Point group: C3
Chain length 90, copies 3
């Protein structure tokens, strides 16, 4: 089984985040113009998607991690990853 990725970007530099689900574990690689480095994201999940939006120059990322029929939303709003209010009855 191949890894599964999800990717988002913002601005014109750009900044890029790539999330990889590997055997149930989702980690994050980051680009800000000067080389790829490992990010703070680390959550369980066999499938992953992501969206993001800017307010001014402040980025907001939402990552959706799925295992079985359970999708968990994870939020970045400048100060650490927190669990979001997303629910879905599957």
């Amino acid at each position: 089984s191949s890894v599964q990725t999800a990717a988002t970007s913002w601005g014109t530099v750009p900044s890029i985040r790539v999330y990889t689900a590997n055997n149930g574990k989702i980690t994050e690689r980051c680009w800000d113009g000067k080389g790829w480095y490992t990010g703070a994201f680390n959550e369980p999940g066999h499938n992953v998607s992501v969206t993001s939006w800017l307010v001014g120059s402040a980025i907001h990322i939402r990552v959706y991690a799925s295992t079985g029929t359970t999708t968990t939303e994870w939020c970045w709003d400048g100060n650490g990853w927190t669990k979001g209010a997303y629910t879905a009855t599957n």
Copy 2:
């Protein structure tokens, strides 16, 4: 097996749409700033991807639903989901 998701967002509130493939069916959950609810999208499919774009204040969404090697495009343009012109030789 796990569900598969795809997400899109627009604006600064923001608005968020999350599409989930589950056992041959794709459904949609929506956020417009005050709680999650279930959206109009409801189409068969085992894999899903999405993109969207604003034209002034008007959002357009395209959802790509695939089963086997067949991929159907569904269009939102302000009032109702309609089948799109996408084709691909697979």
Copy 3:
């Protein structure tokens, strides 16, 4: 068993790019307002994700193609697809 897609778009026409992973081959279908056609992207991979951003009117596209634990970044920056500096630790 179903094919896997990823989509991105830009501008207000819009331009759309849909990437399809089918049996270890990722190919590209393009829309610019006047009908669908096949693009120049052809790379090996079992999973695909995409992000894009505009620099003025010039589009920049990053496609992340994964097989096993290897993810390769492919870069469009106006004149041909080249391999990007993305690496990970998988």
